Amino acid sequence: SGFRKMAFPSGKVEGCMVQVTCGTTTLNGLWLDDVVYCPRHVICTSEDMLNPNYEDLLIRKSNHNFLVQAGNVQLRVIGHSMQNCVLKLKVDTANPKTPKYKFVRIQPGQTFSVLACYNGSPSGVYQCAMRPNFTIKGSFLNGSCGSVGFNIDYDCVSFCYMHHMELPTGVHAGTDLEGNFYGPFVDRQTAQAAGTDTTITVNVLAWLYAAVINGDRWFLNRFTTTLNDFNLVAMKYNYEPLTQDHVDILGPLSAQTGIAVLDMCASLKELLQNGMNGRTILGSALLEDEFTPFDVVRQCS
Amino acid sequence: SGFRKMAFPSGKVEGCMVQVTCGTTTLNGLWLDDVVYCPRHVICTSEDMLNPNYEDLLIRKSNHNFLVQAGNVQLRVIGHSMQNCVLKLKVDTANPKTPKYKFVRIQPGQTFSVLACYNGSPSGVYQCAMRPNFTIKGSFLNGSCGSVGFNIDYDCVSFCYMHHMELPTGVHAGTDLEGNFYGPFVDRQTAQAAGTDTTITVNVLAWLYAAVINGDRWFLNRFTTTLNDFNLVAMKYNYEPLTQDHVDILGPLSAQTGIAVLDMCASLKELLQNGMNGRTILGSALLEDEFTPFDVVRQCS
Ligand SMILES: O=c1c(O)c(-c2cc(O)c(O)c(O)c2)oc2cc(O)cc(O)c12
Ligand SMILES: O=c1c(O)c(-c2cc(O)c(O)c(O)c2)oc2cc(O)cc(O)c12
Ligand SMILES: [Cl-]
Ligand code: NA
């Protein structure tokens, strides 16, 4: 019993973190097989940050412009290339700790664990969600660029995020491990702002189910609704539309608790319309939306 | 920027988790050097839960009554002893993945990371605090007994908790790695209840300092308070007393932010009186008390 925000065990990823230095810039890299992955903005100096020409910056670089350090051991760089916004450094040594892995691009609303690192050294791990506006509400200080996000499926590490930048709101932006940004962002120092965010409705429903499983039942009621009526409420309160696919995904939790999704939607409708009346759900006074249905099943069953 | 409940990277502890079986009971153990630590109630049968005599149960056991599995490798037990409520199994192989470590007993209010495990296999990592009533608000299911809590300040793992049992309210109780319980609890299934819990005042103040460091000042006010007047008020909201030690502990954060400790106490008094009027602090609509002054300095700029 109990319900906590839980991250995946990070050991398999810890063995892949290295330090990458180009000139006076030092950040984190991911060492898998004989390649190190890091943000391409490592090749930028301060005179380049506002309008970098990454093509020209890279062709000017040679292998000897990069220092890769794995703990106390220097890895010799024997090749370099760019894939989108990620720099790929070929090294002369394959990482003996490389886990079974794949690169996976996630969708908004999906969750993942982040291994926050500084100077190639793992510092902490936390769980977060890709927001509908394609930012993440991370916790990053200067030097965390290149920290990665991941899930573990059976025994395979699915890498889904590399950290690139902090936006003026304090939220964070990054890419998949193939260098494609999440969200309408570019790797430059320029006027960039997160769009207005929305709440991840299917995750809120998942968390209400977790609340019921844990004995919190005060928000349940006799009423049911329709997708159509609920989605007009959702739009009203800046909640993502609920789709039929979302309903099917919650099917398991609906079957285990006796509260059909549209039954629970009537609870959520009511909580949006009237509120929590001074009460809490799972120790929170806000409606939590960074647990997926998968996350709830994994932790509650 | 940003602020997350952040756990320590769990790899150093993952490499120590094993499975221990005696009879039909299987739970987790901690393999360090040539010793495996686990809860002594692994030697109980269904008849031995209310009033076990562990001395009498253990003297009946041979080394070969204990099955220890490290992943796929069965470890040979060559000796056993009981230290308070922890069973220690000597094995014929020292764990090659043993990290730098030590055993520490913590005080209420202290935080640590938990690596939740089932059948000797890590499932997830989360952050938590020793409550003033000597329980922890964990997320544990059947089979998690023997999971451990730890910190990793610097490169040394400090083991401070081993999980033994769930109480009727769903909170959790356990021991230090010398087998001494936190709080008045015992390893019997007789009715035991956690005392009334209270809010960890010094941690709430640390988290308000974190909010200021991250750029939020909306909750400050023009007032101050004496220590005694603060405690008279806060105890009416079931907050723990604030001692002069706590005031001294908050000295560095007071210096970094320019807000005197007793001025921040005046702000907390007003927050308890007013609530947040629709606002949040570091993303929360309630006052968070599971970040210590040390944690805030660790994670914040
Ligand atoms: O927010 C940013 C940021 O943090 C870094 C960064 C991270 C590190 O870890 C470093 O060591 C470093 O030198 C820079 O680069 C950036 C580059 C941009 O074009 C835009 C940004 O917004 C950032
Ligand atoms: O709450 C308890 C509990 O969970 C376990 C336990 C944990 C496991 O992981 C097992 O596999 C197992 O068989 C028992 O023992 C207990 C023993 C007590 O005297 C009292 C308890 O309250 C528990
Ligand atoms: Cl302590
Ligand atoms: Na209903």
XYZ file of C-alpha atoms and ligand atoms in Angstrom:
650
model
C 0.000 0.000 0.000
C 0.924 3.655 -0.342
C 1.522 5.575 -3.548
C 4.720 7.363 -4.507
C 6.172 8.962 -7.560
C 8.663 6.249 -8.475
C 11.600 6.236 -10.869
C 13.126 3.234 -12.560
C 16.318 1.883 -10.999
C 19.074 3.859 -12.684
C 22.057 1.502 -12.490
C 22.021 0.463 -16.154
C 22.185 4.125 -17.249
C 24.744 5.205 -14.626
C 27.263 2.921 -16.334
C 26.811 4.872 -19.568
C 27.390 8.466 -18.423
C 30.602 10.237 -19.440
C 31.949 13.796 -19.530
C 32.403 15.594 -22.868
C 34.565 18.711 -23.233
C 34.946 20.912 -26.310
C 37.017 24.014 -25.611
C 35.703 25.520 -22.380
C 32.287 23.791 -22.538
C 31.849 20.619 -20.463
C 28.621 18.620 -20.309
C 27.337 15.052 -20.148
C 27.414 12.362 -22.798
C 25.835 8.935 -23.215
C 28.309 6.126 -24.028
C 26.763 3.120 -25.809
C 28.730 0.630 -27.930
C 31.646 2.712 -29.323
C 29.717 6.001 -29.667
C 29.154 8.918 -27.278
C 25.976 10.996 -27.757
C 25.664 14.574 -26.476
C 23.977 17.870 -27.406
C 25.484 19.450 -30.475
C 25.607 22.836 -28.744
C 28.761 21.565 -27.016
C 30.618 22.867 -30.093
C 29.343 26.425 -29.517
C 31.263 29.199 -27.820
C 29.575 32.297 -26.425
C 30.069 34.246 -29.671
C 28.067 31.517 -31.473
C 25.082 30.940 -29.186
C 22.733 33.530 -30.697
C 22.977 32.469 -34.379
C 25.116 29.326 -34.588
C 25.858 27.793 -37.972
C 26.261 24.219 -36.765
C 27.325 22.947 -40.196
C 30.236 25.365 -40.287
C 31.083 25.010 -36.599
C 31.430 21.239 -36.978
C 33.415 21.036 -40.237
C 35.953 23.347 -38.488
C 36.296 20.763 -35.679
C 38.529 17.692 -35.729
C 38.559 14.629 -33.496
C 41.233 16.259 -31.318
C 38.833 19.088 -30.394
C 36.867 16.679 -28.144
C 37.848 15.269 -24.733
C 35.747 12.344 -23.463
C 36.308 11.163 -19.898
C 34.778 7.993 -18.424
C 35.445 8.230 -14.719
C 39.221 8.573 -14.550
C 39.878 7.164 -18.047
C 40.183 9.282 -21.187
C 38.419 7.837 -24.231
C 40.146 8.559 -27.540
C 37.793 10.108 -30.114
C 38.333 8.613 -33.576
C 35.352 10.080 -35.442
C 32.632 12.729 -35.214
C 29.302 13.394 -36.919
C 25.989 15.138 -36.283
C 22.502 13.634 -36.301
C 19.962 16.471 -36.082
C 20.696 18.236 -32.770
C 22.878 15.432 -31.320
C 26.638 15.114 -31.733
C 27.968 11.567 -32.210
C 31.567 10.915 -31.152
C 33.046 7.574 -32.171
C 35.547 6.360 -29.560
C 38.156 3.624 -29.801
C 36.562 1.546 -27.007
C 33.106 -0.022 -26.766
C 31.427 0.525 -23.411
C 31.621 -2.867 -21.613
C 28.613 -1.817 -19.510
C 26.364 -1.122 -22.514
C 22.904 -2.487 -21.574
C 20.319 -3.888 -23.927
C 18.774 -0.672 -25.252
C 16.773 1.061 -27.946
C 16.130 4.677 -28.864
C 12.405 5.488 -28.561
C 10.532 8.737 -29.137
C 7.711 9.229 -26.640
C 4.363 11.031 -26.895
C 3.015 13.824 -24.709
C 1.546 12.479 -21.524
C 3.996 9.607 -21.280
C 6.323 9.445 -18.293
C 10.004 8.593 -17.942
C 12.864 8.667 -15.449
C 15.624 11.260 -15.680
C 19.158 10.633 -14.409
C 20.402 14.132 -13.604
C 24.183 14.326 -14.076
C 26.919 16.917 -13.643
C 30.356 16.696 -15.246
C 29.515 13.126 -16.272
C 28.688 12.121 -12.685
C 25.163 10.900 -11.834
C 23.641 13.062 -9.127
C 19.958 12.117 -8.805
C 16.999 10.421 -10.426
C 13.403 11.576 -10.676
C 10.252 10.715 -12.610
C 8.544 13.222 -14.927
C 6.051 13.515 -17.793
C 6.396 14.920 -21.291
C 3.915 17.811 -21.034
C 1.325 18.441 -23.766
C 3.351 21.560 -24.620
C 6.442 19.325 -25.047
C 8.381 20.665 -22.065
C 9.286 18.793 -18.913
C 9.135 20.195 -15.379
C 12.612 19.027 -14.462
C 15.157 19.974 -11.831
C 18.361 21.005 -13.591
C 21.263 23.296 -12.746
C 24.029 24.583 -14.989
C 26.049 21.621 -16.216
C 23.159 19.126 -16.504
C 22.961 19.377 -20.322
C 23.205 15.841 -21.793
C 21.414 14.143 -18.900
C 19.082 11.489 -20.300
C 15.567 10.196 -19.736
C 14.606 6.550 -20.050
C 12.171 3.744 -19.311
C 12.970 0.103 -18.664
C 10.793 -2.449 -20.477
C 11.495 -5.980 -19.254
C 15.335 -5.899 -19.440
C 15.803 -3.315 -22.253
C 16.536 0.369 -21.555
C 14.418 2.624 -23.778
C 16.195 5.977 -24.046
C 13.720 8.743 -24.892
C 15.126 12.130 -23.818
C 18.343 14.107 -23.801
C 18.367 17.418 -21.948
C 19.392 20.524 -23.916
C 18.107 23.742 -22.343
C 16.118 25.633 -19.739
C 13.371 27.993 -20.911
C 12.579 31.315 -19.200
C 9.642 29.769 -17.315
C 12.149 27.424 -15.643
C 10.851 24.340 -17.506
C 13.110 22.259 -19.709
C 13.422 21.247 -23.348
C 15.333 18.516 -25.115
C 15.447 15.944 -27.881
C 15.086 12.251 -28.447
C 18.386 10.382 -28.803
C 18.234 10.845 -32.580
C 18.458 14.600 -31.973
C 14.856 15.570 -32.817
C 13.453 18.207 -30.473
C 10.321 17.644 -28.504
C 8.284 20.765 -29.159
C 8.748 23.908 -31.251
C 12.218 24.728 -29.937
C 15.652 25.306 -31.432
C 19.118 24.991 -29.881
C 19.969 28.676 -29.802
C 20.039 31.412 -27.189
C 16.990 33.325 -28.423
C 13.477 34.405 -27.517
C 11.781 31.061 -26.827
C 8.731 30.373 -24.698
C 6.687 27.335 -23.795
C 3.148 27.430 -25.112
C 0.205 27.338 -22.741
C 0.123 23.946 -21.086
C -2.820 21.613 -20.585
C -3.571 18.872 -18.064
C -3.150 15.236 -19.076
C -6.687 13.934 -18.573
C -6.071 10.213 -18.993
C -3.322 10.399 -16.350
C -5.594 12.211 -13.883
C -8.146 9.433 -14.341
C -5.409 6.842 -13.788
C -4.485 8.576 -10.526
C -8.122 8.694 -9.385
C -8.195 4.926 -9.928
C -5.021 4.608 -7.838
C -6.773 6.650 -5.160
C -9.727 4.251 -5.118
C -7.404 1.238 -4.989
C -5.791 2.871 -1.964
C -9.133 3.425 -0.209
C -9.824 7.072 -1.138
C -13.438 6.965 -2.346
C -15.126 10.223 -1.330
C -15.207 11.641 -4.877
C -17.191 8.709 -6.305
C -20.821 9.366 -7.230
C -23.846 7.710 -8.832
C -23.526 9.571 -12.127
C -22.067 8.659 -15.507
C -21.393 10.829 -18.536
C -20.535 10.728 -22.227
C -17.255 11.459 -23.973
C -18.948 14.377 -25.745
C -20.289 16.032 -22.604
C -17.088 15.438 -20.670
C -14.856 16.845 -23.407
C -16.773 20.129 -23.416
C -15.924 20.349 -19.715
C -12.319 19.333 -20.417
C -11.924 22.051 -23.037
C -13.414 24.499 -20.529
C -10.760 23.651 -17.921
C -7.771 23.309 -20.311
C -7.724 19.527 -20.080
C -6.621 17.442 -23.028
C -9.522 15.832 -24.897
C -10.315 12.311 -23.766
C -10.343 9.883 -26.676
C -11.857 6.444 -27.080
C -8.318 5.038 -27.025
C -7.784 6.565 -23.580
C -11.008 4.942 -22.395
C -9.881 1.527 -23.632
C -6.479 1.963 -21.966
C -8.162 2.537 -18.601
C -10.331 -0.551 -19.177
C -8.266 -2.665 -16.783
C -8.576 -0.189 -13.908
C -12.286 0.260 -14.692
C -12.791 -3.499 -14.454
C -10.786 -3.820 -11.230
C -12.622 -1.053 -9.334
C -16.170 -1.165 -10.706
C -16.017 2.484 -11.811
C -16.413 2.735 -15.570
C -14.280 5.469 -17.156
C -17.371 7.589 -17.871
C -18.407 6.943 -14.217
C -14.967 8.185 -13.101
C -15.254 10.950 -15.695
C -18.395 12.085 -13.860
C -16.262 12.260 -10.712
C -13.573 14.250 -12.542
C -16.222 16.425 -14.173
C -17.610 17.094 -10.695
C -14.149 17.764 -9.227
C -13.438 20.239 -12.016
C -16.841 21.916 -11.696
C -17.155 22.018 -7.887
C -13.705 21.139 -6.558
C -12.248 19.141 -3.666
C -14.266 20.914 -0.933
C -11.232 21.120 1.336
C -10.240 17.456 1.013
C -7.246 15.690 -0.503
C -6.700 12.716 -2.784
C -3.621 10.557 -2.157
C -2.142 13.325 -0.047
C -2.417 15.972 -2.765
C -4.666 19.026 -2.929
C -4.139 19.201 -6.715
C -5.232 16.746 -9.402
C -2.044 14.874 -10.303
C -1.383 14.146 -13.975
C 2.143 12.643 -14.189
C 1.091 9.010 -13.562
C 0.127 6.979 -16.622
C -2.328 4.065 -16.457
C 0.723 1.822 -16.933
C 2.434 3.514 -13.986
C -0.575 2.914 -11.747
C -0.894 -0.763 -12.675
C 2.839 -1.305 -12.231
C 2.843 0.175 -8.731
C -0.572 -1.067 -7.526
C -0.525 -4.643 -8.879
C 15.663 25.723 -11.864
C 12.668 23.584 -10.949
C 12.280 21.443 -7.850
C 11.658 17.702 -7.702
C 11.651 15.065 -5.016
C 14.956 13.561 -6.155
C 16.354 10.166 -5.190
C 19.961 9.086 -5.256
C 21.054 7.020 -8.284
C 20.375 3.463 -7.244
C 23.027 1.451 -9.093
C 25.372 0.986 -6.149
C 22.508 -0.577 -4.175
C 21.034 -2.580 -7.066
C 24.274 -4.579 -7.177
C 23.716 -5.648 -3.559
C 20.136 -6.930 -3.745
C 19.584 -10.693 -3.392
C 16.714 -13.054 -2.612
C 16.620 -15.010 0.684
C 14.313 -18.004 1.203
C 13.702 -20.036 4.361
C 10.873 -22.547 4.273
C 8.086 -21.074 2.152
C 9.054 -17.460 2.935
C 11.028 -15.413 0.401
C 12.098 -11.797 0.758
C 14.927 -9.430 -0.055
C 18.422 -9.357 1.365
C 21.371 -6.954 1.189
C 24.674 -8.565 0.128
C 27.728 -6.617 1.301
C 31.195 -8.195 1.359
C 30.549 -11.804 2.520
C 27.416 -11.091 4.594
C 23.734 -11.032 3.586
C 21.428 -8.909 5.798
C 17.685 -9.526 5.905
C 14.731 -9.310 8.301
C 14.837 -12.073 10.859
C 11.146 -12.779 10.370
C 12.180 -14.755 7.276
C 12.515 -17.682 9.714
C 8.837 -17.444 10.790
C 6.095 -19.762 9.576
C 2.391 -18.881 9.538
C 2.149 -20.090 13.166
C 5.049 -17.873 14.317
C 3.721 -14.437 13.489
C 2.035 -13.354 16.729
C 4.542 -14.420 19.399
C 7.674 -15.794 17.736
C 10.651 -16.646 19.909
C 13.385 -15.929 17.410
C 16.119 -17.508 19.521
C 14.214 -20.808 19.531
C 13.305 -20.592 15.839
C 16.878 -19.858 14.767
C 18.647 -22.555 16.803
C 16.626 -25.122 14.803
C 18.080 -23.898 11.490
C 21.127 -25.167 9.641
C 23.097 -23.137 7.120
C 21.482 -25.144 4.292
C 17.963 -24.109 5.373
C 18.750 -20.667 3.840
C 18.619 -20.280 0.053
C 20.299 -17.074 -1.150
C 19.995 -16.272 -4.860
C 22.009 -13.485 -6.505
C 20.294 -13.190 -9.850
C 20.849 -16.666 -11.272
C 23.689 -17.669 -8.908
C 22.908 -19.561 -5.719
C 25.204 -18.378 -2.913
C 26.377 -20.903 -0.330
C 25.552 -19.962 3.266
C 28.366 -20.934 5.641
C 27.182 -19.271 8.860
C 24.340 -17.380 10.446
C 23.634 -15.082 13.365
C 20.975 -12.690 14.607
C 21.671 -9.068 15.571
C 18.550 -7.537 17.125
C 15.858 -7.925 14.426
C 18.253 -8.540 11.513
C 19.489 -11.926 10.345
C 23.094 -12.050 9.102
C 24.068 -14.856 6.715
C 27.752 -15.407 6.053
C 28.246 -16.624 2.469
C 31.277 -18.177 0.796
C 31.658 -15.350 -1.741
C 32.249 -11.647 -1.140
C 30.045 -9.487 -3.342
C 32.361 -8.122 -6.079
C 29.971 -5.184 -6.563
C 30.136 -4.069 -2.915
C 30.317 -0.244 -2.834
C 31.957 1.973 -0.288
C 29.391 1.911 2.497
C 28.577 2.456 6.150
C 25.602 1.903 8.446
C 23.916 4.947 10.013
C 20.900 5.397 12.292
C 18.885 8.462 11.288
C 16.618 10.817 13.267
C 13.020 11.787 12.487
C 12.884 14.404 9.764
C 15.807 12.928 7.860
C 15.268 11.877 4.247
C 16.582 8.932 2.254
C 16.026 7.011 -0.961
C 14.288 3.624 -1.023
C 14.985 0.939 -3.624
C 11.751 -1.058 -3.622
C 12.478 -4.701 -4.504
C 10.533 -7.925 -5.040
C 12.096 -11.403 -5.126
C 15.512 -9.766 -4.947
C 14.801 -7.704 -8.102
C 14.698 -3.894 -8.000
C 11.366 -2.372 -9.037
C 11.687 1.369 -8.447
C 13.338 4.111 -6.452
C 11.680 6.893 -4.502
C 12.459 9.495 -1.873
C 10.958 9.606 1.591
C 11.421 10.858 5.134
C 11.429 9.308 8.578
C 8.216 10.730 10.049
C 8.157 12.130 13.604
C 6.169 9.028 14.589
C 8.992 6.771 13.300
C 7.082 5.441 10.288
C 7.713 6.075 6.615
C 5.029 6.727 3.992
C 6.330 4.187 1.525
C 5.000 2.371 -1.497
C 5.423 -1.311 -0.677
C 3.529 -4.410 -1.761
C 3.635 -7.974 -0.506
C 7.184 -9.220 -0.960
C 9.048 -5.941 -0.390
C 10.326 -6.797 3.116
C 14.106 -6.341 3.221
C 14.153 -3.444 0.748
C 16.545 -0.762 2.013
C 16.825 2.993 2.330
C 20.041 4.903 1.833
C 21.807 8.136 1.051
C 24.846 8.592 -1.163
C 26.375 11.915 -0.189
C 29.788 11.886 -1.882
C 30.806 8.406 -3.077
C 29.804 6.388 0.010
C 26.466 4.628 0.484
C 24.973 5.225 3.940
C 22.397 2.507 4.650
C 19.843 3.781 7.175
C 16.698 1.657 6.737
C 15.538 -1.897 6.150
C 11.833 -2.524 5.583
C 10.101 -5.015 7.904
C 6.361 -4.433 7.995
C 3.211 -2.533 7.093
C 0.977 -1.069 9.824
C -2.834 -0.932 9.708
C -2.962 2.633 8.344
C -0.792 1.580 5.394
C 2.437 3.202 6.605
C 5.678 1.315 7.018
C 8.053 0.353 9.805
C 11.546 -1.077 9.868
C 15.004 -1.037 11.376
C 18.479 0.341 10.928
C 21.059 -2.085 9.536
C 21.975 -3.115 13.077
C 18.424 -4.464 13.403
C 17.099 -1.876 15.877
C 13.598 -0.714 15.035
C 12.789 2.904 14.490
C 10.054 3.777 16.971
C 8.294 1.505 19.467
C 7.486 -1.248 16.974
C 8.329 -4.951 17.174
C 8.437 -7.742 14.569
C 5.191 -9.419 15.674
C 1.858 -9.303 13.843
C 0.012 -8.228 16.989
C -1.991 -5.020 16.762
C 0.363 -2.042 16.574
C -0.555 1.512 15.643
C 1.486 4.501 14.578
C 1.162 7.482 16.878
C -0.446 10.651 15.634
C 1.875 12.077 13.050
C 2.993 15.691 12.822
C 4.486 17.956 10.170
C 8.273 18.345 10.068
C 8.489 22.098 10.639
C 12.192 22.581 9.943
C 11.763 20.888 6.543
C 8.782 23.089 5.626
C 10.945 26.143 6.380
C 13.785 24.736 4.263
C 11.353 24.267 1.368
C 10.115 27.872 1.704
C 13.764 28.971 1.479
C 14.044 26.814 -1.651
C 11.043 28.616 -3.102
C 12.701 32.004 -2.515
C 15.963 30.756 -4.027
C 14.004 29.710 -7.119
C 12.473 33.195 -7.369
C 9.149 33.098 -5.474
C 8.452 35.613 -2.693
C 4.652 35.957 -2.751
C 4.187 34.344 0.683
C 6.552 36.585 2.665
C 5.185 39.321 4.930
C 6.383 42.308 6.926
C 6.229 40.558 10.311
C 8.545 38.598 12.573
C 7.893 36.296 15.525
C 9.545 35.055 18.669
C 10.455 31.366 18.656
C 8.029 30.693 21.484
C 5.089 32.455 19.814
C 5.821 30.550 16.612
C 5.703 27.201 18.410
C 2.490 28.079 20.246
C 0.786 28.736 16.906
C 2.342 25.972 14.795
C 1.513 23.274 17.319
C -2.171 24.157 16.855
C -1.740 22.895 13.268
C 0.027 19.680 14.410
C 3.487 20.976 13.456
C 6.523 19.652 15.365
C 8.181 22.150 17.725
C 10.994 24.205 16.209
C 14.104 24.102 18.397
C 17.150 26.350 18.553
C 19.095 23.560 16.830
C 16.682 23.829 13.895
C 17.117 27.618 13.818
C 20.899 27.155 13.732
C 20.568 24.554 10.978
C 18.662 27.042 8.800
C 21.428 29.650 9.199
C 23.085 29.109 5.814
C 19.809 29.330 3.858
C 18.875 32.464 5.788
C 22.236 33.955 4.778
C 21.915 33.027 1.098
C 18.431 34.569 0.811
C 18.665 37.463 3.280
C 15.510 36.337 5.146
C 15.970 35.885 8.896
C 14.844 32.498 10.186
C 12.189 34.008 12.457
C 10.954 36.170 9.574
C 10.434 32.973 7.545
C 8.637 31.555 10.586
C 6.258 34.526 10.434
C 5.578 33.716 6.787
C 4.794 30.082 7.632
C 2.411 31.192 10.421
C 0.540 33.311 7.879
C 0.426 30.497 5.296
C -1.150 28.175 7.871
C -3.749 30.851 8.634
C -4.553 31.812 5.049
C -3.830 28.878 2.777
C -2.506 29.659 -0.692
C -5.566 31.355 -2.287
C -5.262 29.390 -5.507
C -1.481 29.659 -5.757
C 1.239 27.037 -5.549
C 4.743 26.912 -4.081
C 7.311 24.930 -6.076
C 4.398 23.255 -7.841
C 2.561 22.177 -4.678
C -0.765 23.310 -3.208
C 0.218 21.998 0.254
C 3.255 22.705 2.419
C 5.911 20.064 1.714
C 7.870 18.639 4.632
C 10.054 15.871 3.100
C 12.929 18.124 1.947
C 15.593 18.796 4.593
C 17.828 21.887 4.812
C 20.648 19.670 3.538
C 18.497 18.449 0.614
C 17.669 22.028 -0.383
C 21.348 22.987 -0.527
C 22.072 19.768 -2.451
C 19.516 20.387 -5.200
C 19.232 24.184 -5.412
C 21.566 26.710 -7.022
O 19.883 26.435 -21.289
C 20.915 26.093 -21.939
C 21.922 25.398 -21.301
O 21.824 25.080 -19.979
C 23.115 24.997 -22.085
C 24.246 24.327 -21.423
C 24.163 23.224 -20.581
C 25.359 22.777 -20.013
O 25.337 21.704 -19.187
C 26.571 23.415 -20.275
O 27.734 22.983 -19.731
C 26.625 24.509 -21.105
O 27.814 25.125 -21.362
C 25.457 24.970 -21.671
O 23.247 25.339 -23.397
C 22.260 26.017 -24.053
C 22.449 26.300 -25.399
C 21.471 26.982 -26.107
O 21.660 27.263 -27.426
C 20.312 27.391 -25.462
C 20.118 27.103 -24.113
O 18.970 27.515 -23.502
C 21.096 26.416 -23.392
O 3.832 -6.557 7.438
C 4.606 -7.552 7.502
C 5.162 -8.109 6.358
O 4.901 -7.616 5.110
C 6.082 -9.263 6.489
C 6.609 -9.886 5.245
C 7.239 -9.213 4.184
C 7.613 -9.989 3.072
O 8.241 -9.443 2.006
C 7.356 -11.356 3.018
O 7.719 -12.086 1.935
C 6.722 -11.988 4.055
O 6.483 -13.331 3.984
C 6.346 -11.251 5.167
O 6.343 -9.806 7.725
C 5.811 -9.268 8.869
C 6.136 -9.833 10.096
C 5.605 -9.306 11.269
O 5.913 -9.856 12.472
C 4.752 -8.214 11.220
C 4.422 -7.644 9.998
O 3.578 -6.573 9.959
C 4.948 -8.168 8.818
Cl 19.862 12.130 10.933
Na -19.941 8.341 -11.066
